[PDB]
Structures are given as C-alpha cells and as structure tokens.
C-alpha cells in the first residue's frame, strides 16, 4: 500500500468496549456520609451519552467497597480482544486518591491496577479511560475576575 | 541502546484519568442538574465526539466548567466558588471515537 501513519488508537474493532458506570448515591448510615442528590441525573446522562458512542454500558448503583473491587476484578478478567477501549465512570464521595463505596473507601490505584498492561492482556495497547466525579480534598477555589 | 525496547510498553501506559476537579479540591454537584463536570462532559461529547480528538473535547469541558459555573450558597464559606477539572493523560496516541 501507500505511506502509513500510526498516530491514533485503532477504534474500529467490532465493539467500542465496555462503559462501567458506578453510581453511589446512598451510603451506609455508619459511615456518616450524605446522600449524593442529583447523581442519578449524572448516571442517566452518561448512560445515554456513551450509548450514542456505541459503548456497552453497564450501570451499577450503590456498591460497597467489596462490590466495587469484585466488579473491577471480574471486568478486568473478561476477554476484551474484540473491544477497542475500556471506560469506567466513578460517581461517589472521595478524597485525594480515594473513591468511596457505600460502606468505606477504595484506593483508586487498587481499581486501576486491575487494568495494568501486565494484568489485563486483552487491553494492552488500548485506551483505558477513568472518569472520576468525586472530591479530591477540601480546598475551595475562590476564582479571580477576568 | 536497546532497539528491542519497543517490544515492551510501560504497564501504566494508555490510561487517561478525567478528574472532575484539581488535586486537593472539592468537586461541585448540583442536586437538580447533576455535577458540573458530568453535565459539561456529556454536553461536549454529544457536540464534538464526531469532530474532535478526545483531549480537545476534554479541554472544551475544562473551559465550560471553568467559565459557566459558580456556586451559590447561604454559607459564606461555600459561596461564589469555582472549579477546574484535571485531565491526566498517559495515552500514547490520539483518541477519536469515530473511525473511517
């Protein structure tokens, strides 16, 4: 053939890939964490948006820390060979480096490590997108006039 | 030198983290309209996923969140606050959601 360039990810696999949406609204009373009103609006918007991008969307609601880890582990062990990419959306309480299950925290590194190139071979070389709606601390940005 | 270097890639390569807010900062949600970041992300994906590379879409999300949103609170501590999302890219190629 003619001259080739390799600057963009191959996105014409038979499937775009999974889009896992974890939507934590209600938290166990013992954690002391408030209900995240409005998060169902987010989850529905994301479901529709990624559906239109031809992702296989899976919506999960109100997962414990143990359920989040098990879900991620199981998804990382699926065969992604026919999929172009992987998307995970996390909607929850958080702190720097941390997302909350309904009963306590999960290190974000624990979640993303399941998809490391040496631990998920069928996603090697493919984009792994993590979209995180959660606090990263308690600082507030006062802004500046423009 | 090691021309066989290309035979391995870093295990941390090809991740993209689209954070709603800057390191250390709160992230804002609206109880009626949803979170500022997810509102803006979905709007920009709907408008530009057939037109722009993903990092440029996320830059438009950054601009939308930064310019169009400001908090309203009866509590002075939390009133009139702003937010900037944070794109963290370990990607090695351009990402388009469409193909030829």
């Amino acid at each position: 053939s003619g001259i080739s360039l390799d600057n963009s990810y191959k996105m014409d696999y038979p499937e775009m890939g999974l889009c896992i949406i974890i939507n934590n609204k209600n938290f166990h009373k013992s954690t002391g964490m408030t209900s995240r009103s409005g998060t169902d609006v987010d989850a529905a918007n994301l479901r529709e948006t990624f559906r239109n991008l031809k992702y296989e969307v899976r919506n999960k609601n109100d997962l414990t820390r143990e359920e989040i880890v098990e879900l991620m582990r199981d998804v990382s062990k699926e065969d992604h060979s026919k999929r172009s990419s992987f998307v995970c959306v996390l909607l929850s309480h958080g702190e720097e480096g941390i997302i909350f299950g309904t009963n306590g925290p999960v290190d974000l590194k624990k979640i993303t490590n399941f998809f490391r190139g040496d631990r998920c071979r069928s996603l090697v070389g493919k984009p792994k997108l993590f979209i995180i709606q959660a606090c990263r601390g308690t600082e507030l940005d006062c802004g500046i006039e423009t | 030198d090691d021309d066989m270097a290309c035979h391995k890639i870093p295990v941390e390569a090809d991740f993209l983290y689209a954070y709603s807010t800057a390191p250390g900062y709160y992230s804002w949600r609206n109880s009626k309209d949803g979170s500022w970041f997810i509102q803006s992300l979905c709007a920009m994906l709907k408008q530009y996923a057939d037109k722009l590379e993903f990092m440029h879409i996320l830059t438009r999300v950054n601009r939308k969140v930064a310019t169009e949103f400001e908090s309203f609170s009866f509590d002075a501590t939390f009133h009139a606050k702003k937010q900037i999302p944070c794109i963290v890219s370990m990607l090695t190629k351009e990402l388009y959601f469409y193909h030829h």
Binding site: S92, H93 | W28
Partner: peptide
C-alpha cells in the same frame, strides 16, 4: 450546589 453541594460538594462531594
């Protein structure tokens, strides 16, 4: 508007 709420933080989380």
């Amino acid at each position: 508007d709420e933080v989380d």
